[PDB]
Structure formats: C-alpha cells, structure tokens
C-alpha cells in the first residue's frame, strides 16, 4: 500500500481531453501521459449517459443509463480495449470512475430493478442531493443489488486495473468490503480510491439518517481517500482567511488520524474544482504548489491540462474541450518532482511537517539512516532559513544546482530546497 506514496495519477475527462472527445483522442496521446511520469490513468466515467432529466447538451459522466456500456461519444467497445491495450503495453495501470451511489431515472436497473431504488411517497424515485435532479439513489439496503454491483466490477477488472469510487460514503462499507472481498479474489492487484467527503458533507448526511461514512472507514475497503478533510485548509491558507500554523496543524492531526499505511490522494484542482491556475497566476506559484502535493505523504493527483496551466474548469454538461486551454508548460517539473517521488525515503513511516522561517513549511522524511528534506515556500519567502547540515555545497534535488550551507543556514530564495542526506 505504501507503495503509492512513489506513484502519481494522472485524470483524463474523455468527452473533453481532445477535439474529438473520444477513447482513440486519449489513445492516440497515451506516451505523453506516460512520459509525464503518469502511474495510475484515471478515466472519468465511460458509460452511456442518462437522457431522462439530463443536465445540460451531453448530460453529466455521473448520470450513469449503463453501468456495462460504453458512452457512444467515446466509441465502442474495441476503442475502449485499444485504450487500455496501449496504457499497459506502456505499463500504466488504468482505473475507471465508479458511479454506485444513484443512476439516472431511464437506467437499465431503474428499468429492469425498480425495487433496488428508494422510493418516496408517490412511489417516484427519489435524491438526497438537492442538486442532483439528473439521478436516482439506489438502496444498498436490497442485497441482490450487491451482486449486480460487483459482476459489473469483475466484467470491467478484464480490462482494467482499479475503481475511483464516487461519493463513495454514500455507499454502506458493508458493500464496499465485499465489492473488495470479490473483485481482489480474482483479480489480486486490484487498487481502490475512494471520493471520500468533507465533515461538512457527512454531517448532513448523517444528521438526515442517511449513511455517511468516515475517512478511516473507507480505509477498511480503500487503498486512498481524497483530501477532502483539509483541502478546504489549504484553500483558507491560500487564500489568506487562515494561516499557515493552523494549516500544518490540521495536517499534523492528518496524519495520526489514519493507519499507518494510509495513502491520501493530495491535489490542487480535479475535474469538480477550480483549476490550479486561477488559484494562483504564475509558474513560481506552481512550482512550489506542485512540489508540496508531491512531497506531502501521499500520493499527488495531475487534473489533465493541468501540466499547461490550464484556467478553466471544464463544465460536467456542455461540450468544453479542453484543447486551446494551455498556457504554458511545466511538465519538466512534474517529471522531475516524479523521480524524487520515486525515492524509497517517500514510503519512509517518519515523515514530518514544521512551519519554518517566514512561514516556510518544512517536510522531512527519514529511514534506515538517511533523510530527505523540503523546505517549500508556498508564499515566495525568499530567506535564510536554519539546519543541522555541516557546512558546505548539496545538490538541491529539484534543480540538480548546488546550495549552500553556511554558519547552520541554507538560502531558501522563493522555490523548494529539497536535500537528501545521511
């Protein structure tokens, strides 16, 4: 499980990626994905698509008509199988959205298994998001639906290599157990991440006796959560409504929280939020974000387009290629932020956070007799900040340039210093 610390994933909205918004658009550029230093490729939902109360011109990925068909904008079957042929000759695992929470109200289960709904007064079926109006809550509470449910997993396992839970808290862990117990039974490599909430979320949904599950409950069941329980921290750090102690406290408390093999997905934007890149505005800032989504404990998350800066958010309804949305290049530094990734000390059980000079988050690692730290400016400090390290020249790790120890003090001028040592 640890070993996901070293990876990155890479999510590619299909309909979106190209201007052709099919499979053979992604096919067609999989070495790229792959060179960017992509482990796991996540493909948005791949299904056909609910026309009954259908949000916008092509409707949402998540309002799902068929959970075993492939979405005719993407293609067929074969194109979907070309997909996935190429991403492992290049040896890339892929992992599919899974959309179990609800179906659109025209789905093959609504149609053919109605009782396997909830069912309001009228008998209509029925959201618990208000928002939703596109889909229909399935009743985890009939154990046949189970095993529809996990057929359809072990139909897709054939093809690909792990399953990103939607809402996956929603769903009840006894489901999840059993969908893992199944799935991992015949197809051993398995890997599951699950969308996991934020309190705010879950709260709700609890308060209103739906089920809403913890964090550490989709551990029993997952490999990763999302970090849904502090990226709201790092927004309010950013945006300058909290500071960075409280950040790195909330962290601190992160990371004891959950077992020791956790694996968090870390990110700064995905396919339901604002870009990186209108968060903040120049190459320095991304520098120093995307380094500490790689160097925090975990595993980082690359939203695609998000390696050209891209500023738009994709819509989940309308047609919103992607394409002309680039506005610079940092797959340099996304290659090279994966070979430091890469580095056993990243799987390494002592891994500390510290606020620093200037405000100036300090990361270390440490095992078996070697360390690395990063001190990462996340505002720009430019400042002398203090370490242990005898004097002398180390390769900063990010640039491969030398950096200077002098009298218990390093330059940190604006960017990551990050310093492998004994």
Same mark, same amino acid.
């Given at each position: 499980? =640890?070993?996901?610390?070293?990876?990155?994933?890479?999510?590619?909205?299909?309909?979106?990626?190209?201007?052709?918004?099919?499979?053979?658009?992604?096919?067609?550029?999989?070495?790229?994905?792959?060179?960017?230093?992509?482990?796991? +490729?996540?493909?948005?939902?791949?299904?056909?698509?609910?026309? !009954?109360?259908?949000?916008?011109?092509?409707?949402?990925?998540?309002?799902?008509?068929?959970?075993?068909?492939?979405?005719?904008?993407?293609?067929?079957?074969?194109?979907?199988?070309?997909?996935?042929?190429?991403? $492992?000759?290049?040896?890339?695992?892929?992992?599919?959205?899974?959309?179990?929470?609800?179906?659109?109200?025209?789905?093959?289960?609504?149609?053919?298994?109605?009782?396997? #709904?909830?069912?309001?007064?009228?008998?209509?079926?029925?959201?618990?998001?208000?928002?939703?109006?596109?889909? *229909?809550?399935?009743?985890?509470?009939?154990?046949?639906?189970?095993?529809?449910?996990?057929?359809?997993?072990?139909?897709?396992?054939?093809?690909?290599?792990?399953?990103?839970?939607?809402?996956?808290?929603?769903?009840?862990?006894?489901?999840?157990?059993?969908?893992? *117990?199944?799935? &991992?039974? *015949?197809?051993?490599?398995?890997?599951?991440?699950?969308?996991?909430?934020?309190?705010?979320?879950?709260?709700?949904?609890?308060?209103?006796?739906? =089920?809403?599950?913890?964090?550490?409950?989709?551990?029993?069941?997952?490999?990763?959560?999302?970090?849904?329980?502090? #990226?709201?921290?790092?927004?309010?750090?950013?945006?300058?409504?909290? =500071?960075?102690?409280?950040?790195?406290?909330? +962290?601190?408390?992160?990371? @004891?929280? #959950?077992? %020791?093999?956790?694996?968090?997905?870390? #990110?700064?934007?995905?396919?339901?939020? /604002?870009?990186?890149?209108?968060?903040?505005?120049?190459?320095?800032? /991304?520098?120093? &974000? +995307?380094?500490?989504?790689?160097?925090?404990?975990?595993?980082?998350?690359?939203?695609?387009?998000?390696?050209? +800066?891209?500023?738009?958010?994709?819509?989940?309804?309308?047609?919103?290629?992607?394409?002309?949305?680039? $506005?610079?290049?940092?797959?340099?530094?996304?290659?090279?932020?994966?070979?430091?990734?890469?580095?056993?000390?990243?799987?390494?059980?002592?891994?500390?956070?510290?606020?620093?000079?200037?405000?100036?988050? *300090?990361?270390?690692?440490?095992?078996?007799?070697? @360390?690395?730290?990063?001190?990462?400016?996340?505002?720009?400090?430019?400042? /002398?900040?203090?370490?242990?390290?005898?004097?002398?020249?180390?390769?900063?790790?990010? =640039?491969? %340039?030398?950096?200077?120890?002098?009298?218990?003090?390093?330059? !940190?001028?604006?960017?990551?210093?990050?310093?492998?040592?004994?």
């Amino acid at each position: 499980q =640890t070993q996901l610390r070293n990876e990155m994933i890479y999510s590619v909205f299909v309909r979106n990626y190209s201007e052709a918004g099919n499979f053979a658009g992604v096919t067609a550029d999989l070495q790229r994905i792959k060179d960017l230093g992509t482990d796991i +490729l996540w493909l948005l939902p791949i299904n056909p698509i609910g026309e !009954v109360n259908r949000k916008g011109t092509l409707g949402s990925p998540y309002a799902i008509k068929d959970y075993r068909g492939i979405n005719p904008e993407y293609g067929t079957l074969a194109d979907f199988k070309a997909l996935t042929d190429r991403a $492992h000759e290049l040896g890339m695992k892929v992992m599919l959205d899974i959309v179990y929470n609800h179906t659109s109200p025209d789905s093959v289960l609504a149609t053919e298994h109605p009782e396997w #709904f909830y069912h309001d007064a009228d008998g209509q079926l029925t959201n618990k998001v208000g928002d939703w109006s596109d889909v *229909k809550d399935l009743d985890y509470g009939h154990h046949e639906l189970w095993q529809y449910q996990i057929d359809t997993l072990l139909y897709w396992s054939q093809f690909v290599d792990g399953y990103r839970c939607d809402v996956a808290p929603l769903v009840p862990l006894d489901f999840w157990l059993e969908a893992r *117990k199944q799935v &991992n039974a *015949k197809y051993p490599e398995t890997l599951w991440l699950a969308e996991s909430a934020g309190s705010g979320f879950i709260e709700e949904l609890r308060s209103q006796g739906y =089920t809403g599950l913890s964090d550490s409950e989709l551990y029993q069941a997952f490999d990763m959560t999302y970090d849904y329980d502090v #990226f709201g921290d790092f927004k309010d750090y950013w945006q300058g409504r909290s =500071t960075v102690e409280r950040y790195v406290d909330l +962290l601190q408390r992160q990371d @004891a929280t #959950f077992p %020791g093999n956790y694996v968090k997905m870390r #990110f700064l934007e995905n396919h339901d939020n /604002a870009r990186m890149m209108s968060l903040m505005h120049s190459k320095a800032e /991304a520098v120093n &974000n +995307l380094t500490w989504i790689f160097m925090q404990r975990g595993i980082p998350l690359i939203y695609n387009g998000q390696e050209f +800066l891209a500023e738009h958010q994709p819509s989940l309804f309308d047609r919103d290629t992607m394409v002309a949305d680039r $506005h610079g290049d940092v797959t340099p530094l996304i290659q090279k932020l994966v070979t430091i990734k890469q580095l056993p000390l990243l799987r390494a059980a002592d891994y500390q956070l510290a606020v620093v000079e200037e405000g100036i988050v *300090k990361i270390t690692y440490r095992a078996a007799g070697e @360390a690395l730290t990063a001190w990462i400016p996340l505002k720009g400090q430019v400042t /002398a900040v203090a370490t242990k390290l005898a004097a002398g020249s180390y390769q900063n790790l990010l =640039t491969d %340039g030398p950096t200077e120890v002098v009298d218990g003090k390093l330059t !940190v001028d604006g960017q990551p210093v990050l310093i492998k040592y004994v």
